[PDB]
Design a protein around this ligand. Sequence first.
Ligand SMILES: C#CCCOP(=O)(O)OP(=O)(O)O
Ligand SMILES: C#CCCOP(=O)(O)OP(=O)(O)O
Ligand code: F3S
Ligand code: F3S
Lengths: 401, 401
Amino acid sequence: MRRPTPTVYVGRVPIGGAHPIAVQSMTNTPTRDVEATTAQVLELHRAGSEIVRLTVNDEEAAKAVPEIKRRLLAEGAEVPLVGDFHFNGHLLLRKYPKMAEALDKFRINPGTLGRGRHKDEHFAEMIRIAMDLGKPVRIGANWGSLDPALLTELMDRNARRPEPKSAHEVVLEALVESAVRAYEAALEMGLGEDKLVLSAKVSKARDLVWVYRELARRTQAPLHLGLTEAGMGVKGIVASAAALAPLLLEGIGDTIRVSLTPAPGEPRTKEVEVAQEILQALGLRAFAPEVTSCPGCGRTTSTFFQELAEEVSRRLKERLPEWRARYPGVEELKVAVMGCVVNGPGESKHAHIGISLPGAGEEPKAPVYADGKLLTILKGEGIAEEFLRLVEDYVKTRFAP
Amino acid sequence: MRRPTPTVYVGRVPIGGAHPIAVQSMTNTPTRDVEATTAQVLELHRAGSEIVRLTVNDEEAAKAVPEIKRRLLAEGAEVPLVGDFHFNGHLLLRKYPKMAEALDKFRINPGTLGRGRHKDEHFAEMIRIAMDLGKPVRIGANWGSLDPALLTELMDRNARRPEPKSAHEVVLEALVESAVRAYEAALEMGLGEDKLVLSAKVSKARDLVWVYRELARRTQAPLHLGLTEAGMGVKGIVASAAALAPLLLEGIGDTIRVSLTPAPGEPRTKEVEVAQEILQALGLRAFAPEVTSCPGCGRTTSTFFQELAEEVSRRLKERLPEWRARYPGVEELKVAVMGCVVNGPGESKHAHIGISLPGAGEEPKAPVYADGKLLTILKGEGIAEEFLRLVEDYVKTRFAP
Ligand SMILES: C#CCCOP(=O)(O)OP(=O)(O)O
Ligand SMILES: C#CCCOP(=O)(O)OP(=O)(O)O
Ligand code: F3S
Ligand code: F3S
């Protein structure tokens, strides 16, 4: 069901309907701080951010970008950099051509170009520079910065309707129109279809689904999908997954970014982890082995079961760097850890390998299944260590080169 | 878009297309431990579990249920109880009529009824008892416990097809068929449409969407929706949201349960919180005020912004018990906390009330918007306390009785 699109290369990373959905992220360090920004770019890339965006907000930020890129290259890190421009993007790209050349993509917001007539000039200048340098561009609209003139135009169109739509609905129409008009304008100026990505972000999940369905229908471009301003903690994680899934399941979206607010002291890499989990939950990409486990109920002994599931998950995460190097395809591994006979055997049989613990009323033994059939039955002390040895043995055989 | 269904009352809680989607959960204490189970039922109910399920797995569990119910009633807690039966449900309901009468709903799994001919007898006996006592029933299939005879029947049907489907696809067909056949059988026996809820759970999100679309098409019943065995931590949360959202957005589902594995020492109420967050993210129910905040970038000072967003979220959660009592509709409150001028004002204008902090290059002042227009501009020390006073003032006026 994947929506076909042309391919847009962001550095070495291809984005589009023929390619895996790419995970990206954005730094939160001051871009002018070269050491801090370089470190975080590397951190995010190592966590799985295939593309990294950084704000290029003033002259000091712009002068730093070439040095950041140089440092990344010096350690063989080929992570593409997207420059986020607002208000003065045309001035910065004009004045600092080394920055323009160092970036792998430019982000333009059609709502932060300036006022009235100046918008069109500023937009054209940035597209001109991208064309001269062979750079791709994201035209990214956001409802936090919606073009007010376009909003009035569409409010007037709506008022003329036999049955006018709500103000809220018109805001969404205008956001879509902002992206689509700027898309069409960039194409008319000669920027190639292989150099244009679009986004039109809102902060409410049901609205995001409406917007992206319209974008997908009305344009041919690959789409950068995300729920903007998703927020903190569990709310942010849930809202982001809830917003993206209906679209990704329908085949809409070519790159994603999860816009979480970090808690103080929480790593910026959390958003990368969440993005990966969304794609893997929907079977669109595989990044690491996953554990299926039941919630546990009154049929299990809660703490032993919870401890085993946690220990198995912890070991898989410890083994992954090595496994990824030795065992191609191991990212697809499914392990089950289950609490009793009700669903334990059946769920374990659906995993590559799973263990079903004895619950209430059962004999104190734990069947282990692999590839849908009984492998062995464990008992006594060290169930956990015996199981993890069996998982290691399984991986060696199943995912051998 | 909500799928119409008859109403099924679970105690005082109506489930169906005419009613709010109900959040439920399940205990993990041994049901025989009356003190522990009663406490957790109350804990879950207080967290927002409108219905609570408990395993009734043996005779000791069954004898405990009437006392649990008595204790709940003694504190005016009207929380409906669902009894989860496997293997011996027919024996327990027969032998312990006080338990049968004390429960507000019976859960039957058509894959844990027994072997061959005995299945039909056991099923009929449980439905007989529900009918005699006027109790509703969930017929809940789970792929961890799929009826093997039905699976063979459908494997044979599939082998006769001009183009046979995959084994995996046939497993899903069989799961649906298990629920649908048992549904039809219960109706034919005289159990009313106002007494039947269906579920057919799998552990993979894209498969769950397929299954529930089939269930929704082929039956008229309200549906209990959940991703079974979702797992631990972020994986579990993301998988659950990703699986449910496409269905809930399409109007499918009448009650949900989130099947998270608690980390050792993590409260059982986490699943209730996640369930509520899924429904609120999709605009289907409102439980508590929510904070929209940006991720922060190099345009903000990371820690001040993150600290303010966290402090605002913490205060809203502290004020809620009181607010819920005084200010009807306050559950719908949207507050924004934003990092700079790029999206700060616009996003704040979409919330009921929001603050936009000064980012890089800006004057050190923080505009506050309420109902889409400028309310005031804050500066200096105590921005956080001044903002929270403004939020209190706003709530008093907006959500006054
Ligand atoms: C830049 C910035 C703040 C908002 O980031 P976002 O990824 O949520 O939205 P975007 O910048 O509109 O793509
Ligand atoms: C009971 C039990 C273990 C699985 O619980 P679940 O809510 O994920 O699935 P269900 O019992 O099939 O409704
Ligand atoms: S939730 Fe309960 S039914 Fe068994 S497989 Fe897990 S212990
Ligand atoms: S993410 Fe950055 S652009 Fe401004 S509103 Fe938030 S600081």
